[PDB]
Short mmCIF file of C-alpha atoms in Angstrom, two decimals:
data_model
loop_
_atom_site.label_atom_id
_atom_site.label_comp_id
_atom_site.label_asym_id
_atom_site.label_seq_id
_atom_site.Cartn_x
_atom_site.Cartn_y
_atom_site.Cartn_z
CA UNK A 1 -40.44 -34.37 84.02
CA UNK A 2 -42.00 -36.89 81.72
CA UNK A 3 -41.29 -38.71 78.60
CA UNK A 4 -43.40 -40.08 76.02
CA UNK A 5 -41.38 -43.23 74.81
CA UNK A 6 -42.27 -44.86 71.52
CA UNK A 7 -40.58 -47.64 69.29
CA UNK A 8 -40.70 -46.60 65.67
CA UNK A 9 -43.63 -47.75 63.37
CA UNK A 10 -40.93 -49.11 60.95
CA UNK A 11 -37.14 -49.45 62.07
CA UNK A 12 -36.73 -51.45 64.71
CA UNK A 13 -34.43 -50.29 67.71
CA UNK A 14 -35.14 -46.57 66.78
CA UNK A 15 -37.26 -44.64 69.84
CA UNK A 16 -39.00 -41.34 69.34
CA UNK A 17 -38.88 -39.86 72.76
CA UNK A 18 -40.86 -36.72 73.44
CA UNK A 19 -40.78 -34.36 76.29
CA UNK A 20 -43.14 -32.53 78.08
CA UNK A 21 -42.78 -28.78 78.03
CA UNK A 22 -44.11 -25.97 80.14
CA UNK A 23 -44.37 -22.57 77.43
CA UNK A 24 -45.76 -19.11 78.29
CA UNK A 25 -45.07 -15.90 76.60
CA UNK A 26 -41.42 -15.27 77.71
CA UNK A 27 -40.64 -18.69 76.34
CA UNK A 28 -40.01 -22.36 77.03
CA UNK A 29 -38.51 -24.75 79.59
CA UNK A 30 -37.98 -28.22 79.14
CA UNK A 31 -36.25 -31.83 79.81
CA UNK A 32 -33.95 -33.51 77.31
CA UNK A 33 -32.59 -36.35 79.03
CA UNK A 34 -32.46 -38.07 82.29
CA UNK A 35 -30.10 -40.99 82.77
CA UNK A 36 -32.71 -42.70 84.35
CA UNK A 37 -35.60 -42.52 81.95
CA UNK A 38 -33.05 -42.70 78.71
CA UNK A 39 -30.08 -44.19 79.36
CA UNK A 40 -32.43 -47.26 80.16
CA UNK A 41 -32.88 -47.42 76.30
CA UNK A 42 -29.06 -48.57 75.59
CA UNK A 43 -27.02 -51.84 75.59
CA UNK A 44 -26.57 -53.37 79.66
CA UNK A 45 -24.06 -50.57 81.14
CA UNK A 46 -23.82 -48.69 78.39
CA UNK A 47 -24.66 -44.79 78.91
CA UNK A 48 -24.35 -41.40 76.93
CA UNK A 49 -21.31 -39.65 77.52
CA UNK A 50 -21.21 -36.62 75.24
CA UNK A 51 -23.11 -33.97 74.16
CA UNK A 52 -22.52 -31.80 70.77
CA UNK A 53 -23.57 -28.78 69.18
CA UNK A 54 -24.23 -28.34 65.32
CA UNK A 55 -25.42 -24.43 64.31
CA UNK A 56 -26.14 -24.55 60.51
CA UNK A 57 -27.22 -22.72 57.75
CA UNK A 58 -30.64 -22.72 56.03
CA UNK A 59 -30.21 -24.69 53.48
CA UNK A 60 -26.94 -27.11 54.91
CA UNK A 61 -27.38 -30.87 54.99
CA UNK A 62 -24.88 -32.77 57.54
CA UNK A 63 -24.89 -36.53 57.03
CA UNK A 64 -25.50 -39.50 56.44
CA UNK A 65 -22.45 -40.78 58.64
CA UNK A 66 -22.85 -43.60 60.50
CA UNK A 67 -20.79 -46.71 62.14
CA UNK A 68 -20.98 -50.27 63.99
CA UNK A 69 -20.86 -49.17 67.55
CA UNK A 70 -22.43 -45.34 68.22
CA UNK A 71 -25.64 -44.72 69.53
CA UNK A 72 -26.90 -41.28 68.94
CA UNK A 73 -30.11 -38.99 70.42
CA UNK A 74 -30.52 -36.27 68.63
CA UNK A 75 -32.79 -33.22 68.38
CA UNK A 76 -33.62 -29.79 66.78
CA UNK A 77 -33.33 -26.85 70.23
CA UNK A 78 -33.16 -23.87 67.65
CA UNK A 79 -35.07 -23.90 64.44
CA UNK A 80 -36.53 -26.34 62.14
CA UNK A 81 -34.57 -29.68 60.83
CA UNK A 82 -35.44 -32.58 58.57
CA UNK A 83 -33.62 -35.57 60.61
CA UNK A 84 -33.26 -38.50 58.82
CA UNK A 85 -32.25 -42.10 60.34
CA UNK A 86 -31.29 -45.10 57.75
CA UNK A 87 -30.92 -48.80 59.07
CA UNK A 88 -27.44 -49.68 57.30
CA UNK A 89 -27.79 -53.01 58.87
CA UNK A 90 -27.36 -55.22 56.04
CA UNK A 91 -28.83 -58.69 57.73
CA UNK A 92 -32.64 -56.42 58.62
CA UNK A 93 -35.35 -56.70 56.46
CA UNK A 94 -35.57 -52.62 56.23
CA UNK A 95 -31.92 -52.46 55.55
CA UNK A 96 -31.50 -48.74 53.63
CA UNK A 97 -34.98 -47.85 54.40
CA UNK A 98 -35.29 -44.53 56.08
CA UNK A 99 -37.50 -42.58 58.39
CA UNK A 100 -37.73 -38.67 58.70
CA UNK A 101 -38.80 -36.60 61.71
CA UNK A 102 -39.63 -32.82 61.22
CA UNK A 103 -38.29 -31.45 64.38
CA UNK A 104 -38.84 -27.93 65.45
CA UNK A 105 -40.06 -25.93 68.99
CA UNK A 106 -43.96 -27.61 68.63
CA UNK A 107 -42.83 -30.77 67.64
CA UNK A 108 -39.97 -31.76 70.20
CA UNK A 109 -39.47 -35.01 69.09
CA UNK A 110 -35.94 -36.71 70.40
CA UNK A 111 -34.65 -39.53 68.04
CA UNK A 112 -32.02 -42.54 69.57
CA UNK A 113 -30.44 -43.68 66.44
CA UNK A 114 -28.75 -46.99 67.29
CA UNK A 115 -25.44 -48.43 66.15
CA UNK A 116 -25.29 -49.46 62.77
CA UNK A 117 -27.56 -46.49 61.40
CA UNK A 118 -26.55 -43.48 59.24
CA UNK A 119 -27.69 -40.33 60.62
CA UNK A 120 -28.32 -37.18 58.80
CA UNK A 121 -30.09 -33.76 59.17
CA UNK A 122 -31.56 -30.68 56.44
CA UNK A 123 -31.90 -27.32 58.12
CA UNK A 124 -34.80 -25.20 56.55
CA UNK A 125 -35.24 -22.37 58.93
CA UNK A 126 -33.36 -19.41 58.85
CA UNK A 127 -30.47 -21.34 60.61
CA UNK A 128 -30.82 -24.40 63.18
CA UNK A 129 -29.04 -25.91 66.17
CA UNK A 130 -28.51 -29.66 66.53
CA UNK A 131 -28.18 -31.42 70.16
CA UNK A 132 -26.88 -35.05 69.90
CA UNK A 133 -25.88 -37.09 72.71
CA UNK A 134 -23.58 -40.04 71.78
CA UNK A 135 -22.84 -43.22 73.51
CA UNK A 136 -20.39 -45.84 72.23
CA UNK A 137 -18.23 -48.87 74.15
CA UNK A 138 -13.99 -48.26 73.49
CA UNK A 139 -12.95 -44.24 74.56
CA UNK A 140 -9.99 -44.51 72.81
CA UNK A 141 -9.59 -45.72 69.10
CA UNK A 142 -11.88 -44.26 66.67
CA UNK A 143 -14.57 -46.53 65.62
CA UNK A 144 -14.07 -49.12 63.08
CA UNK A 145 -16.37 -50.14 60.10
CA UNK A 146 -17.57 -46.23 59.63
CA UNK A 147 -19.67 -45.14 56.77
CA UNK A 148 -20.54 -42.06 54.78
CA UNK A 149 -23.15 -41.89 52.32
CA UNK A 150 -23.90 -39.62 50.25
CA UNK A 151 -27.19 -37.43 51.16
CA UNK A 152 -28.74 -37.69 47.55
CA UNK A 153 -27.72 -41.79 47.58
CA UNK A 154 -29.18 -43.56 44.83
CA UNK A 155 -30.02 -46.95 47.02
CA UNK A 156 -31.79 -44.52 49.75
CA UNK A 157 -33.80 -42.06 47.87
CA UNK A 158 -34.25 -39.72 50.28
CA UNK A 159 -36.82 -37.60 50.09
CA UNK A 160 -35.13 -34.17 50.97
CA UNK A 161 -36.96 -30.58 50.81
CA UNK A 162 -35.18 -29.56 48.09
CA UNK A 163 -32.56 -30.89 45.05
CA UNK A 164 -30.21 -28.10 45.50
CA UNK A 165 -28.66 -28.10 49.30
CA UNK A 166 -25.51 -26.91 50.59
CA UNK A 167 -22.80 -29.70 51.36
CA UNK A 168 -19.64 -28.77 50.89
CA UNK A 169 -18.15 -25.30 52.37
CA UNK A 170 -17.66 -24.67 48.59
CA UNK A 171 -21.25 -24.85 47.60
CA UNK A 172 -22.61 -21.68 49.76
CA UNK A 173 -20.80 -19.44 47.64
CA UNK A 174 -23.74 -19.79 44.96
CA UNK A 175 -26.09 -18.60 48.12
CA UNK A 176 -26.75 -15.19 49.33
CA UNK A 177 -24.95 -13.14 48.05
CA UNK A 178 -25.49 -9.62 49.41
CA UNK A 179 -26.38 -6.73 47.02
CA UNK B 1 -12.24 -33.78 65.37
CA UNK B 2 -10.33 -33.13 68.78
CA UNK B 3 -11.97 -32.71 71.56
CA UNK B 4 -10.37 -30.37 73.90
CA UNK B 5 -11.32 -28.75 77.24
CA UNK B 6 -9.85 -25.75 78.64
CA UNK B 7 -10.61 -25.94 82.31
CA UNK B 8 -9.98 -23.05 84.95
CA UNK B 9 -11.03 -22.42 88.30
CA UNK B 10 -12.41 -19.10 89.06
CA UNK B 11 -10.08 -16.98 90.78
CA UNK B 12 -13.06 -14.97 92.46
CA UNK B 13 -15.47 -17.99 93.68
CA UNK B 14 -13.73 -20.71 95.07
CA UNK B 15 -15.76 -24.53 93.42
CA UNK B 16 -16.76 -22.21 90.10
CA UNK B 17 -15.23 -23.97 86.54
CA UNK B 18 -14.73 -21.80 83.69
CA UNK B 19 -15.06 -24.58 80.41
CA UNK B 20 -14.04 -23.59 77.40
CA UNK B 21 -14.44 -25.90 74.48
CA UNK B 22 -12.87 -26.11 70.95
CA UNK B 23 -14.88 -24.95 67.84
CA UNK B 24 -14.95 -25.27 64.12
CA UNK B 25 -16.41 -22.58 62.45
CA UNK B 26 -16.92 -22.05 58.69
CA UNK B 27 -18.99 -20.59 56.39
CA UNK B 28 -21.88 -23.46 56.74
CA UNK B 29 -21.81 -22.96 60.40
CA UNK B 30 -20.27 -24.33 63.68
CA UNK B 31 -19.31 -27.32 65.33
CA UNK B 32 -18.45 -28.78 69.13
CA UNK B 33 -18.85 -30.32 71.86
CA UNK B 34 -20.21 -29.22 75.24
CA UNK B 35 -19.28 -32.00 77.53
CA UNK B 36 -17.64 -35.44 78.20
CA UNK B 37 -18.24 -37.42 81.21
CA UNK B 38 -14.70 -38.53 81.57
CA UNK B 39 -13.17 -34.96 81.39
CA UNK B 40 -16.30 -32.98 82.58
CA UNK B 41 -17.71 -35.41 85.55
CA UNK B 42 -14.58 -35.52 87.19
CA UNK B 43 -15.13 -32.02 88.09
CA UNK B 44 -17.31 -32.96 90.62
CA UNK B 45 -17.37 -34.42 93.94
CA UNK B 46 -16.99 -38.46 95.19
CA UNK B 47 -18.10 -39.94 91.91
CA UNK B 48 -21.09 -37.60 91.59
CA UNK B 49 -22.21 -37.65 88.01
CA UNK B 50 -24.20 -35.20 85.49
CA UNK B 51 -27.32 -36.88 84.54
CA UNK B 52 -30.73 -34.15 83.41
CA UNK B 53 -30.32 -31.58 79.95
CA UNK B 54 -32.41 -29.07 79.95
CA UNK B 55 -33.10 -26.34 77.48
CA UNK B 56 -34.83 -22.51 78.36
CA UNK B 57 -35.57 -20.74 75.77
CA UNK B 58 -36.44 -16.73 76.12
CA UNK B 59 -37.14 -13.33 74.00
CA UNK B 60 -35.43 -10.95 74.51
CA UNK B 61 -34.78 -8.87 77.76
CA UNK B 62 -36.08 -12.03 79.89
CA UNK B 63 -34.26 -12.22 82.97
CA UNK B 64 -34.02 -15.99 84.82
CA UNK B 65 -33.11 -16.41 88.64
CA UNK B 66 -31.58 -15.83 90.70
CA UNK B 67 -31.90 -19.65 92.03
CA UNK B 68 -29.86 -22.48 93.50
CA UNK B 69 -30.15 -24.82 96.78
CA UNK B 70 -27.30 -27.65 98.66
CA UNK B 71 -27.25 -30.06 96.99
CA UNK B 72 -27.49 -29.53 93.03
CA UNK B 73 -24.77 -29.04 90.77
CA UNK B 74 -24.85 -26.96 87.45
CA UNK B 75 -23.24 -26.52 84.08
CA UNK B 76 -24.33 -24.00 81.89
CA UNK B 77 -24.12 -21.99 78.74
CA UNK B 78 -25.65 -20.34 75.66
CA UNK B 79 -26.51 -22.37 72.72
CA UNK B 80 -27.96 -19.28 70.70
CA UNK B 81 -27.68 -16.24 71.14
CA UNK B 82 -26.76 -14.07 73.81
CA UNK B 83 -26.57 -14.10 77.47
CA UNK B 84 -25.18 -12.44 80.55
CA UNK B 85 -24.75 -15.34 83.17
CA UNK B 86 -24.33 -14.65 86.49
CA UNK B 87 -23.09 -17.27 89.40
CA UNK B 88 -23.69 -16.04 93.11
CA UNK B 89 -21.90 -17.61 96.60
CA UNK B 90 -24.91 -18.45 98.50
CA UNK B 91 -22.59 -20.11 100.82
CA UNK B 92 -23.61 -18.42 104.43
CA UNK B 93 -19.92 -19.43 105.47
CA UNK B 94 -17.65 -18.66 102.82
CA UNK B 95 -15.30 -15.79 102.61
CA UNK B 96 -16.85 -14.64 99.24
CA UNK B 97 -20.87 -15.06 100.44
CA UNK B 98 -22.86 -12.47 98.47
CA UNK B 99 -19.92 -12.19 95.65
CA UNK B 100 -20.74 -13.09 92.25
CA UNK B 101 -19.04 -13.65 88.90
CA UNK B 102 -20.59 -12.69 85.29
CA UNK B 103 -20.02 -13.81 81.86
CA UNK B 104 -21.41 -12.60 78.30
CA UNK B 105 -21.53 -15.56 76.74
CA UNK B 106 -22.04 -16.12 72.85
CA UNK B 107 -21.00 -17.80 69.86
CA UNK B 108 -17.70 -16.30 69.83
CA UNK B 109 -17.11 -16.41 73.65
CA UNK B 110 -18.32 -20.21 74.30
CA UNK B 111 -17.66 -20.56 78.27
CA UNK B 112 -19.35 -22.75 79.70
CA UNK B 113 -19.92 -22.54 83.68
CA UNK B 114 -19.72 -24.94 86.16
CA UNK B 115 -21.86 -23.49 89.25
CA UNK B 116 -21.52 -25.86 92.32
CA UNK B 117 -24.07 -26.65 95.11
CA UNK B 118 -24.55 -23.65 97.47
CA UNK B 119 -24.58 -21.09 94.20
CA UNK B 120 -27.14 -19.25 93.07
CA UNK B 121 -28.01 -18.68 89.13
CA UNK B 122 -28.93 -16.37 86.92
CA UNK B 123 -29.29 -15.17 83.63
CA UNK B 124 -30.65 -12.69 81.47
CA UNK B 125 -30.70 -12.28 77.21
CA UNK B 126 -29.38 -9.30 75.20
CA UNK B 127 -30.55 -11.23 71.78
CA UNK B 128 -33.83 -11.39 69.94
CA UNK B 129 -34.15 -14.64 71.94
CA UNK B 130 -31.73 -17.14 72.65
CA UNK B 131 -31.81 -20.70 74.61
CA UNK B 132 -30.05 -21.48 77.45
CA UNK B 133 -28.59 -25.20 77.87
CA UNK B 134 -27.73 -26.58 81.32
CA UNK B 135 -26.95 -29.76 82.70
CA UNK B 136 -27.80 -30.73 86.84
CA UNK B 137 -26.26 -33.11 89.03
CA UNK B 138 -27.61 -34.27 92.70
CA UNK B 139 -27.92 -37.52 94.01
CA UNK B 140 -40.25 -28.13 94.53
CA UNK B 141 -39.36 -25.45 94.38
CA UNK B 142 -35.39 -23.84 94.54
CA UNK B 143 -34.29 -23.95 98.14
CA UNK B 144 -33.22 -20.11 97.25
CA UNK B 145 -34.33 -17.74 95.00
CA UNK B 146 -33.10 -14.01 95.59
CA UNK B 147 -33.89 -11.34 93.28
CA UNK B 148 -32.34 -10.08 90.19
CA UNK B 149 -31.56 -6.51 91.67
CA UNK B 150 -30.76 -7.80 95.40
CA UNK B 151 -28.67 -5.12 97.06
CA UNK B 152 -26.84 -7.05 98.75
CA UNK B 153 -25.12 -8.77 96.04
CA UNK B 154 -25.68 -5.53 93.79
CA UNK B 155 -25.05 -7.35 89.83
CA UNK B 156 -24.09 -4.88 87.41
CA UNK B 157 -27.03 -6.02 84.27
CA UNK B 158 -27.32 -4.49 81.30
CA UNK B 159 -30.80 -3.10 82.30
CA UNK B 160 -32.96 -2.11 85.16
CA UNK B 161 -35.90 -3.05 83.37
CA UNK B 162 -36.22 -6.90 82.57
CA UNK B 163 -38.98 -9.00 81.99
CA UNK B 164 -39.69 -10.81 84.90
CA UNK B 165 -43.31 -12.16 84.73
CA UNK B 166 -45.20 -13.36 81.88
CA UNK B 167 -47.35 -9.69 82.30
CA UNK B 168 -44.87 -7.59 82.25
CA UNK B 169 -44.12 -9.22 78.04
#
């Protein structure tokens, strides 16, 4: 079990954490997280405490939400995702800058996406699974000082794969519509 | 979004958890969460604590296990796909030794399976592929592996002929 640990090139506190995986024809085994090698990452005595599941859509953005407090690692174990992680610190010099990781089965990269940055995700395979692991101080009253922003955010720019995703549950009735 | 946990002891395997989470489902897909520490970790014994994730993923007709040892706990489901998993009592001394539980596990039948030290594991996958998520807990190889098609624990499996080695694929 190994990690490959690396600050990012541009938004400081983010890590880009990649396992090592062992792959033959039947298919793939691998590490996400060990509290010793990860949870090492956080705030003294802080550790992740949850784990969540997001299957999507082709096509389906989720994001950018974000808050004060929550640290997030997240990663693509089903598919292909765009993950996108914006510093909404507004005291850093890369405040609303971005960076986007391209996540899929040969590229297992593992994101920690500190407090005080908007997370988001685009699914363009077929349909994709998000892990996330969250940790956060305070079990008990939902986090103050949250934000949503919009995925197509004027300030942000994102650069998404397309113009046209699905957001809204609404908004996939346009889409495949069977013949 | 509530979290919620339905939590029930198997009735067959004394030490086996049955965890069955809330979902939201819609047309853009589904959301929820596998685990907490506080209601999850409390499951196990003297403060012990869940702390490795790890991901399998196989094609189709792949068969995993059966493996377990003393000292390591498990907790266990299907992420995509489909899966029949199987926990075994590996315990020499306990009054269900060779018995085993089995669960088809999928999107619409989200258990997720707590499989305590002294338990063997197993699964096998009835989808075009699917990956398997489980977390350990403890404070080489397996101490025990047994095979799939042991007699002496006789599982009932969708097939007798799985893929057990990267020939036979």
């Amino acid at each position: 079990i190994e990690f490959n640990i690396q600050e990012s090139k541009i938004l400081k506190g983010v890590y880009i954490i990649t396992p090592n995986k062992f792959r033959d024809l039947r298919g793939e085994i691998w590490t996400a997280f060990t509290s010793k090698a990860v949870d090492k990452l956080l705030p003294n005595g802080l550790k992740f405490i949850h784990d969540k599941f997001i299957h999507s859509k082709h096509n389906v953005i989720r994001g950018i939400h974000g808050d004060v407090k929550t640290y997030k690692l997240a990663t693509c174990v089903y598919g292909e995702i765009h993950q996108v992680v914006v510093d909404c610190r507004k005291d850093s010099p890369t405040y609303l800058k971005y960076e986007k990781f391209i996540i899929n089965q040969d590229n297992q990269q593992i994101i920690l996406v500190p407090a005080g940055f908007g997370n988001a995700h685009y699914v363009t395979s077929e349909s994709a699974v998000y892990y996330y692991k969250c940790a956060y101080k305070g079990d008990y009253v939902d986090a103050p000082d949250q934000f949503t922003y919009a995925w197509n955010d004027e300030r942000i720019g994102i650069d998404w794969p397309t113009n046209s995703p699905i957001l809204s549950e609404r908004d996939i009735l346009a889409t495949k519509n069977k013949g």
